[PDB]
Amino acid sequence: SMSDPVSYTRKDSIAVISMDDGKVNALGPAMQQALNAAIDNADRDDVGALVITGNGRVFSGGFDLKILTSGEVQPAIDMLRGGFELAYRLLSYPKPVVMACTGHAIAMGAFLLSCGDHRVAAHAYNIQANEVAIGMTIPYAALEIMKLRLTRSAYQQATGLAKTFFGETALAAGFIDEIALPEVVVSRAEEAAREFAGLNQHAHAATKLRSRADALTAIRAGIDGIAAEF
Amino acid sequence: SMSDPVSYTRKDSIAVISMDDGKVNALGPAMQQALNAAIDNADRDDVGALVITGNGRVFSGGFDLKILTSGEVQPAIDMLRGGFELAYRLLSYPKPVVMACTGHAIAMGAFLLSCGDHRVAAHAYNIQANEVAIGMTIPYAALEIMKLRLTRSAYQQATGLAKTFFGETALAAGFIDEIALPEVVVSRAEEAAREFAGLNQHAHAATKLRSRADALTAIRAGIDGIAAEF
Amino acid sequence: SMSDPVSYTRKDSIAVISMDDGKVNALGPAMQQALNAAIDNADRDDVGALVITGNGRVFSGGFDLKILTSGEVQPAIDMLRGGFELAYRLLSYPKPVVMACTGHAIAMGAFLLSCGDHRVAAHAYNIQANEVAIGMTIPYAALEIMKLRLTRSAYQQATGLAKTFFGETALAAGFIDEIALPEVVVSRAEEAAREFAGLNQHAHAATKLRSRADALTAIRAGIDGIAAEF
Ligand SMILES: CC(=O)CC(=O)SCCNC(=O)CCNC(=O)[C@H](O)C(C)(C)COP(=O)(O)OP(=O)(O)OC[C@H]1O[C@@H](n2cnc3c(N)ncnc32)[C@H](O)[C@@H]1OP(=O)(O)O
Ligand SMILES: CC(=O)CC(=O)SCCNC(=O)CCNC(=O)[C@H](O)C(C)(C)COP(=O)(O)OP(=O)(O)OC[C@H]1O[C@@H](n2cnc3c(N)ncnc32)[C@H](O)[C@@H]1OP(=O)(O)O
Ligand SMILES: CC(=O)CC(=O)SCCNC(=O)CCNC(=O)[C@H](O)C(C)(C)COP(=O)(O)OP(=O)(O)OC[C@H]1O[C@@H](n2cnc3c(N)ncnc32)[C@H](O)[C@@H]1OP(=O)(O)O
Numbered sequence A, B, C: 001s002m003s004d005p006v007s008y009t010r011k012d013s014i015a016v017i018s019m020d021d022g023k024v025n026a027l028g029p030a031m032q033q034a035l036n037a038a039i040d041n042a043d044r045d046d047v048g049a050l051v052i053t054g055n056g057r058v059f060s061g062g063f064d065l066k067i068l069t070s071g072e073v074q075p076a077i078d079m080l081r082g083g084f085e086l087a088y089r090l091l092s093y094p095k096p097v098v099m100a101c102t103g104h105a106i107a108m109g110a111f112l113l114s115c116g117d118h119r120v121a122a123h124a125y126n127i128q129a130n131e132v133a134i135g136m137t138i139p140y141a142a143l144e145i146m147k148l149r150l151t152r153s154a155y156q157q158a159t160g161l162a163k164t165f166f167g168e169t170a171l172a173a174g175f176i177d178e179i180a181l182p183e184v185v186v187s188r189a190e191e192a193a194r195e196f197a198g199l200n201q202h203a204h205a206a207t208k209l210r211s212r213a214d215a216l217t218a219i220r221a222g223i224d225g226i227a228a229e230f
Helices: A029-045 A073-091 A108-113 A140-149 A152-160 A167-173 A182-196 A201-210 A213-224 B029-045 B073-091 B108-113 B140-149 B152-160 B167-173 B182-196 B201-210 B213-224 C029-045 C073-091 C108-113 C140-149 C152-160 C167-173 C182-196 C201-210 C213-224
Strands: A006-011 A014-019 A049-053 A058-060 A097-101 A104-106 A118-121 B006-011 B014-019 B049-053 B058-060 B097-101 B104-106 B118-121 C006-011 C014-019 C049-053 C058-060 C097-101 C104-106 C118-121
Touching (some): A006 A029, A014 A182, A029 A049, A029 A073, A049 A182, A058 A097, A058 A108, A073 A108, A073 A213, A097 A108, A104 A108, A108 A140, A118 A182, A140 A152, A140 C152, A152 A167, A152 B140, A152 B201, A201 A213, A201 C152, B006 B029, B014 B029, B014 B182, B029 B049, B029 B073, B049 B182, B058 B097, B058 B108, B073 B140, B073 B213, B097 B108, B097 B182, B104 B108, B108 B140, B118 B182, B140 B152, B140 B213, B152 B167, B152 C140, B152 C201, B201 B213, C014 C029, C014 C182, C029 C049, C049 C182, C058 C097, C073 C108, C073 C140, C073 C213, C097 C108, C104 C108, C108 C140, C118 C182, C140 C152, C140 C213, C152 C167, C201 C213
Parallel strands (some): A014 A049, A049 A097, A097 A118, B014 B049, B049 B097, B058 B104, B097 B118, C014 C049, C049 C097, C058 C104, C097 C118
Antiparallel strands (some): A006 A014, B006 B014, C006 C014
């Protein structure tokens, strides 16, 4: 929403990519462009690991609702495809990816969060696929992302019932991996990233793909199936 | 077992369907007929959500053991097929379904319980697929129902070892979603149902099916495979 | 490593098979041969259940690193194939199998552990697929074994991040089923085994296979795919 919604900072073995559009980090075309460019920077720098953060208010409130509800079909399709493409890129990323969930993560915000190898949040941040609560069916690509992380029963309630998770319930459900106090969420994320950069990169990259093979295939299908959804 | 084993009561936005055959709510042909008819009533009333309860003694002790062990093959086949058909109907039901687990849930009782979008029990109610303990192999349709809800490791022990779950262990395993005191299990179920009726029905119905697609397909196969089991 | 690395002791309804090569119970050809022979003994004795233990130092430190890194391709292939064959044999074993995790279980040690119907450890024993930390990609057969037991999110971190689990985190993740004090790990294992011997054997054997059908098929493929890995 702001003109310059993503910052990139390299600190030794890691790259820190921060979303702040001055509002709720809506994942519209400009934000997606800025995130892809930031990842290109990390590629160029051949960093050991990535940390992705939100701002002080949210991790992200999801796709841009203005575009989603504008009545223009192809722009909405393209926004959704771009968001799930970014999810694909992060889930298959050859370096460890750590998410600093610095506030609430709703819908595409929660799906983006769910692409990190490690995810840190504070206890009062809501994580929810709210689609059903607002009259939308969850796209197949999103379901596959959630199915990769959420326990079988948590997955059931997260989808059909739009259940909100947080703190201990998010940890148990598999929506996050670590709970920390708000003031140290980013620091904990950076610490984990520095540790994971110590793993063998080749083995990490190859193994993560094997552990996500079916999901990645289904996500590709889901991306090519977005049009059909509309 | 009693002549009139199911009651149907509409309360504002929900329908409450209660099993009480005066004994252990055996899921024989009469009980299955009564449950299907009660669901037909909820369809006619276009209710916002369903609550299904057991009695003061059990949720259900499962299929009628008398019929199961009578030596008459086709009646046993038909009873099993009907039970898993009912499971299918509830898992695909277009409105939120909340189970009030008012006592122990054994075998088909536990599988029926596992068809609710939300399931509430008290801490001392046993939930168990006891088939292996009594010399029976678990039908594929039942396995698919359990695999939809139980964590990977809980699923292993629930099946091959006939493990009994309750209270905190049932919650962790995914055999239930909420623990409440016995005297408020039904009230909590009704409260949740009223909340879920507030979700968008079209989106709930479409999303729940997507979140259960593979299970539903496998359950259909399992229903058509019952004969082969005998 | 020692000349006589496995002991077999029949106690009433169970057989106790103990690994102790005088070091870290490396799963090389001699150890695999001794374990298979011990299982043959249990077959001959038609025991009610199996307990498999490590020594005072570890459950097992995994495959023999000397052979793995010797530069001789076929011996390394054969060692890996034999280890996953043993895993297959135990996962499909017609009697209940209980693992007494008497110390750390690393890599193939953790995969072997994950083949038990019930697994008991003490709280400070590390359970880890350390492959990525040491520059190796996890074999598909190993991934399938882990995917059978670890929750969706634990599976992600166990593989790509070589996460170490122990105590409460191992229990939650699905790397173990029971935590006990070190001095009673074996006793608890034997107690559980005696209980499981009371289950109907025919039903246990048939049900466990159904609950593991996809994993077993994929493990067979993974065994035939070991060569390709090298
Ligand atoms: C289609 C898909 O399958 C999934 C896609 O992601 S669709 C996007 C779905 N996302 C949503 O519906 C978000 C619902 N909103 C929220 O959860 C909360 O607003 C929030 C947690 C994101 C922020 O909460 P908050 O800090 O307390 O601020 P709040 O009082 O709620 O209002 C947020 C402001 O940003 C706007 N906003 C919130 N989410 C937005 C989004 N995804 N796109 C565009 N604007 C958004 C609100 O309209 C409001 O704007 P104004 O105050 O200027 O009128
Ligand atoms: C074939 C499949 O794959 C799965 C199918 O579901 S097969 C059904 C498998 N179900 C069982 O084996 C049930 C085993 N029984 C139980 O778990 C317990 O009886 C219970 C939890 C259901 C009730 O426990 P309880 O309130 O303490 O009563 P309890 O003292 O155990 O006895 C229950 C009474 O109902 C009967 N009963 C229990 N389950 C029954 C069933 N599923 N069908 C017909 N009768 C049943 C018992 O025979 C006993 O009858 P009587 O006292 O008249 O002789
Ligand atoms: C290829 C695959 O996909 C998976 C296969 O399993 S490959 C095997 C991977 N396993 C490993 O890398 C094991 C790494 N080592 C460990 O985790 C720890 O050594 C352990 C937990 C096994 C034991 O810890 P410990 O009791 O504190 O003893 P520690 O001080 O670490 O040293 C262990 C001793 O046994 C040796 N050892 C440890 N694991 C071994 C293995 N898998 N094969 C052969 N030797 C091994 C060490 O070299 C050391 O030997 P020396 O003291 O004689 O030089």
